[PDB]
Amino acid sequence: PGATLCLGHHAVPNGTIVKTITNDQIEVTNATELVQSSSTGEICDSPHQILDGENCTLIDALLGDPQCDGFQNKKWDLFVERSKAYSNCYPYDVPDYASLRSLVASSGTLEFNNESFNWTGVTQNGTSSACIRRSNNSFFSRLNWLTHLKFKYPALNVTMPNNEKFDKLYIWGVHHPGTDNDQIFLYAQASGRITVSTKRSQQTVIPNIGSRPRVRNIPSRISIYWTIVKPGDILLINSTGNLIAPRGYFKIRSGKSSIMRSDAPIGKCNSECITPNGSIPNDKPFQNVNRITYGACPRYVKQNTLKLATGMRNVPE
């Protein structure tokens, strides 16, 4: 009689279909998913330092819009800008807005140091009804609206040395009045000219008088500019009117900070990968949640599923 000895291999009743080089559908005993396609919908508050902008854009928090006083001197790994955010101060624009936003986001700090600028000869601390702080007319906290003193605005030629070991970021502006009369009521002479310089750089801006559509009943505008001053260099401001002056400087740091647009709630949880849809697990190598990411994240791909075989071909009885 003798014996029979048969060699074989397992199979399962519930196999999974994978793709190969030669076949788009072959059944294997087991597989694992390589694309993360879901989020819980919350941005976890750990382990990255999250700063929820709430009603404020980064730039409004920078300039000091009255809804953003709580942000003073705060730092972040990730600043989260909400779609509901709106400005509620004097109407302004920023030539190159995208770049100022980017460079502040990347720096990761709103640390501000006041400095004593010699504004002899003019009235400081100008305010407006378009910028209410505690029912009182107010203005951007980090900016100083200069006007005539006793119907004189003498030429400003004001200096500020950088004797620090780090770079200084100065934010400043030019006021564009709505009418020829407003120019006179504020600055006591015809349209000014601003020149902000260092040993390395120069910027001159011309105020342009004229009506813009009213925002909070203001047909005037402010245009915002910035200047970086290196150690041992000197800021020089030269103006005969229309200057929205700095009150000091921001520290500019380098590191891993950024900014993201999202309406996702912040949750008390721990996740390394942030997307605008919420945090996602980062075990998988790929994800199709969002091309926008921050942290240790899977790489964005177009596929919604990619199955990696983890078993042999399934050959059921």
Partner 1 sequence: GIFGAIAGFIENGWEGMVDGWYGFRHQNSEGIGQAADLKSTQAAIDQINGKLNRLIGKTNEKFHQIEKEFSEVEGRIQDLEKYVEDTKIDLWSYNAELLVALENQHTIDLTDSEMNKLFEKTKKQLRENAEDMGNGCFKIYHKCDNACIGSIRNGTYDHDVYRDEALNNRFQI
Ligand X SMILES: CC(=O)N[C@@H]1[C@@H](O)[C@H](O[C@@H]2O[C@H](CO)[C@H](O)[C@H](O[C@@H]3O[C@H](CO)[C@@H](O[C@@H]4O[C@H](CO[C@]5(C(=O)O)C[C@H](O)[C@@H](NC(C)=O)[C@H]([C@H](O)[C@H](O)CO)O5)[C@H](O)[C@H](O)[C@H]4O)[C@H](O)[C@H]3NC(C)=O)[C@H]2O)[C@@H](CO)O[C@H]1O
Ligand Y SMILES: *[C@@H]1O[C@H](CO)[C@@H](O[C@@H]2O[C@H](CO)[C@@H](O[C@@H]3O[C@H](CO)[C@@H](O)[C@H](O)[C@@H]3O)[C@H](O)[C@H]2NC(C)=O)[C@H](O)[C@H]1NC(C)=O
Ligand Z SMILES: *[C@@H]1O[C@H](CO)[C@@H](O)[C@H](O)[C@H]1NC(C)=O
Ligand U SMILES: *[C@@H]1O[C@H](CO)[C@@H](O[C@@H]2O[C@H](CO)[C@@H](O[C@@H]3O[C@H](CO[C@H]4O[C@H](CO)[C@@H](O)[C@H](O)[C@@H]4O)[C@@H](O)[C@H](O[C@H]4O[C@H](CO)[C@@H](O)[C@H](O)[C@@H]4O)[C@@H]3O)[C@H](O)[C@H]2NC(C)=O)[C@H](O)[C@H]1NC(C)=O
Give me the residues that bind ligand Y (CB under 6 A), please: 157, 159, 179, 211, 213-214, 217, 219, 234
Q: How many CB atoms lie within 10 A of CB 14?
A: 9
Given a contact cutoff of 8 angstroms between Cβ atoms, the answer to whether 43 and 293 are in contact is no
Residue 16: contacted member of ligand Z, its own copies, ligand U, none (CB under 5 to 8 Å, by partner type): ligand Z
Binding-site member from 115, 310, 312, 315 for ligand U (CB under 6 A): 310
Contact flag: residue 30 with its own copies (CB under 8 A): no
Rounded-to-integer distance, Cα 317 and Cα 313, Å: 13
Select from 182, 191, 209, 301 the one that contacts ligand X (CB under 6 A): 182
**Nearest-angstrom CA–CA distance, 123 and 116:** 15
CA 151 to chain centre: 40
Show the binding pattern over residues 206-235: x = contacts ligand Z (CB under 6 A), - = does not: ----xx------------------------
Phi and psi angles of residue 63, each rounded to the nearest 5 degrees, phi first: -70, -35
- Choose which of 136, 211, 303, 310 interacts with its own copies (CB under 8 A): 211
**How far, in Å, CA of 10 to CA of 18, rounded?**
18
Residue 159 or 203: which CB sits closer to ligand Y?
159
Which of the choices ligand U, its own copies, ligand Y, none does residue 26 contact, using the CB cut-off of 5 to 8 A by kind?
none
By CB under 6 A, the residues from 134 to 173 that bind ligand Z are: 155, 157
| Integer CA distances (angstroms), 87 to 142, 177, 210, 213, 215, in order | 15, 19, 22, 16, 10
Residue among 126 and 311 whose Cβ is closer to ligand X? 126
Contact mark string toward ligand U, 30..69, x via CB under 6 A: x-x-------------------------------------
Find the shortest distance in angstroms from Cβ 210 to ligand Z.
Answer: 4
Footprint on residues 222-251 left by its own copies (CB under 8 A): 233-234, 236, 238
Token pair, residue 47, equals: 């382990």
- On whether the CB atoms of residues 247 and 62 are closer than 8 A, the answer is no
Contact 25, 16 (CB under 8 A): no
How far is the C-alpha of 98 from the C-alpha of 103, rounded, in Å?
9
Give the whole-angstrom CA distance, residue 296 versus residue 78: 13
> Measured from the CB atom, is 214 or 261 closer to partner 1?
261
Establish if 129 lies at the interface with ligand X (CB under 6 A): yes
CA–CA distances in Å: residue 22 to residues 18, 19, 26, 314: 11, 8, 9, 16
- Of 117 and 226, nearer to partner 1 (C-beta) is 226
- List of residues contacting ligand U (CB under 6 A): 30, 32, 283, 310
- List of residues contacting ligand X (CB under 6 A): 126-130, 137, 145, 147, 177-178, 182, 184-186, 217-218, 220
